[PDB]
Structure 1
Amino acid sequence: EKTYTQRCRLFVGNLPADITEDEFKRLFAKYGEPGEVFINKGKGFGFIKLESRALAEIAKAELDDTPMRGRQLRVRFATHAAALSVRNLSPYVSNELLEEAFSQFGPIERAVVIVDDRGRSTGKGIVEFASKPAARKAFERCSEGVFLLTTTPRPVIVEPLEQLDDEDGLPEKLAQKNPMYQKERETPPRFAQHGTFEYEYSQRWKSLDEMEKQQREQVEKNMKDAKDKLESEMEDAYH
């Protein structure tokens, strides 16, 4: 579990211009003792670590989209700076096996194996360390060397985790910053009908996307056939 981890840090954006270090703590007062507190008084955002992930998820759920001296607050979890993308996993790697494996590089905040809608592993996973240099060590040694998890010499591919945001997307209020957003909205959503000036090129875009799909599915099919032949010649493990 551990207290005041990086998974407990919350991002509080759109703060008032005259926000102070102690007033920012008065917001999260009823969530225990505040941990590391930093605020960017210029841009108007700040970070704060809570005692546990549970307290952080409760404070995020209660304080997000709430007013403060006029401005609406944007509360979310800060982007984990020590997160690594783990892929090329065998379908027999668990969360504990993934955590026990990468624990030798440093303290593990969390380690999960991404699964599909049924529960089967997708061959990819996520590992989050307590410090960024700990994740850098795991990223370097796994890429410079060969790190195995099972008996099969299937190496693990470690990359920096591209953390996307599918919770709070891109609100329209933030989209009004660019003037061309309103210029694009001059035409409402529609279906391109034949005979239109834009119909000829809409079908060419859809044809280009179909060409991209056919080429990428051909590449991903050749790797699967190559990955299956490696496990076939492995049966001939004798030198």
Structure 2
Amino acid sequence: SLLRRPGEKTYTQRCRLFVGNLPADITEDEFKRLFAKYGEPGEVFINKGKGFGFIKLESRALAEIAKAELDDTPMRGRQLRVRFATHAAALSVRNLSPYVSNELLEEAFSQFGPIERAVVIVDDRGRSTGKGIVEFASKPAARKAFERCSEGVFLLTTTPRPVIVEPLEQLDDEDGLPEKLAQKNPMYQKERETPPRFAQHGTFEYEYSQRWKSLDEMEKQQREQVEKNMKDAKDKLESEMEDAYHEHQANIL
């Protein structure tokens, strides 16, 4: 129903909402009427047996409004839980040149299948982190990109930097671990009997904790030394391979 199309691509997986705690006797019509305010519905999936469903709306904006408006609202004695659906066809990409843009990444990955979005993750100064996200329309397109970039060498720019493609890690930093669930542990009462505190010089917990911190600091130093050791190995490889291939030199063979 939107007069101006929000963009080139609509009803993407970033426009998909998860709705939990539906009533036992939900119907598709009732489910669609819940979202009627937010334009023409796209794909609808309802698990009537398990009390949840999915809907795609036309735009990310409409999904954000629906979530904000419908989350924690009553339906026949149940508070609806509305969340953005976790993306089923998303990949992490890393080892990106700093001169790879969102559009280059999308253009590149579009060869694997229809692509919804690609983004280069930037730091607080707008500089590339060398990492990105690619969101495909279909799981098979994501699987082909994952398999082909794993087996082969996919290059986006002049500098030979193979794109490293991994499953996108999707952890929950919205709901987290509420005290309602934590309390179900037997030893919870015993763990909370001592309040948050600074440990004091001379106590067992202070001495244990300072030694633990010293091992953690040693682990940090060793992990940094490994990165430095492997950077030197990668720079030595580059120099040896340039020489093997006579990169700065004409040679018939």
User: Shared fold by TM > 0.5?
Assistant: yes
- Measure how far apart 1:27 and its partner are: 1.6
> 1:182–1:114: structure 2 CA closer, same or farther, 3 Å change rule?
farther
- Measure how far apart 1:44 and its partner are: 2.5
Quick one: distance in 1 between partners of 2:182 and 2:80?
17
- After alignment, is 28-37 or 221-230 more displaced? 221-230
- After alignment, is 211-220 or 140-149 more displaced? 211-220
- Measure how far apart 1:235 and its partner are: 6.4
- Measure how far apart 1:4 and its partner are: 1.8
- Measure how far apart 1:23 and its partner are: 2.2
> 1:226–1:117: structure 2 CA closer, same or farther, 3 Å change rule?
farther
- Measure how far apart 1:108 and its partner are: 0.8
- After alignment, is 171-180 or 104-113 more displaced? 171-180
**What residue in structure 1 maps to residue 250 of structure 2?**
none
> 1:82–1:187: structure 2 CA closer, same or farther, 3 Å change rule?
same
> 1:217–1:67: structure 2 CA closer, same or farther, 3 Å change rule?
farther
> 1:69–1:127: structure 2 CA closer, same or farther, 3 Å change rule?
same
Quick one: distance in 1 between partners of 2:12 and 2:199?
51
**What residue in structure 1 maps to residue 251 of structure 2?**
none
> 1:188–1:86: structure 2 CA closer, same or farther, 3 Å change rule?
same
Q: Mark the runs of 5 or more structure 1 residues left unpaired by the alignment.
A: none
Q: What does the per-residue CA deviation read over 1:54-112, in whole Å, with 9 as the maximum and x for residues that have no partner?
A: 21111112222333334333211111110011001111100000000001001111100
Aligned match of 2:122 in 115, 133, 139? 115
- Measure how far apart 1:180 and its partner are: 4.2
Quick one: distance in 1 between partners of 2:180 and 2:190?
15
> 1:9–1:234: structure 2 CA closer, same or farther, 3 Å change rule?
same
- Measure how far apart 1:141 and its partner are: 0.7
Counterpart secondary structure, 1:19? coil
> 1:202–1:67: structure 2 CA closer, same or farther, 3 Å change rule?
farther
Aligned match of 1:6 in 13, 21, 24? 13
> 1:16–1:202: structure 2 CA closer, same or farther, 3 Å change rule?
farther
> 1:6–1:231: structure 2 CA closer, same or farther, 3 Å change rule?
same
Paired residues in the alignment total 238
- Measure how far apart 1:156 and its partner are: 0.6
Counterpart secondary structure, 1:234? helix
Quick one: distance in 1 between partners of 2:28 and 2:192?
41
- Measure how far apart 1:182 and its partner are: 4.5
Q: What does the per-residue CA deviation read over 1:100-156, in whole Å, with 9 as the maximum and x for residues that have no partner?
A: 000100111110001111111111110010000000001111111111111112111
**What residue in structure 2 maps to residue 19 of structure 1?**
26
Counterpart secondary structure, 2:37? coil
> 1:207–1:225: structure 2 CA closer, same or farther, 3 Å change rule?
same
- Measure how far apart 1:213 and its partner are: 0.9
- Measure how far apart 1:221 and its partner are: 2.1
**What residue in structure 1 maps to residue 3 of structure 2?**
none
- After alignment, is 14-23 or 228-237 more displaced? 228-237
Q: What does the per-residue CA deviation read over 1:18-37, in whole Å, with 9 as the maximum and x for residues that have no partner?
A: 43333222221211122222
- Measure how far apart 1:218 and its partner are: 1.2
> 1:66–1:174: structure 2 CA closer, same or farther, 3 Å change rule?
farther
Counterpart secondary structure, 1:22? helix
Counterpart secondary structure, 1:79? coil
Q: Mark the runs of 5 or more structure 2 residues left unpaired by the alignment.
A: 1-7, 246-253
> 1:28–1:213: structure 2 CA closer, same or farther, 3 Å change rule?
same
Aligned match of 2:51 in 17, 21, 44? 44
Quick one: distance in 2 between partners of 1:3 and 1:149?
27
- Measure how far apart 1:230 and its partner are: 5.1
Counterpart secondary structure, 1:125? strand
Quick one: distance in 2 between partners of 1:203 and 1:67?
50
> 1:230–1:137: structure 2 CA closer, same or farther, 3 Å change rule?
same
- Measure how far apart 1:236 and its partner are: 5.2
Tell me the TM-score normalised to structure 1 length.
Answer: 0.88
- Measure how far apart 1:163 and its partner are: 1.4
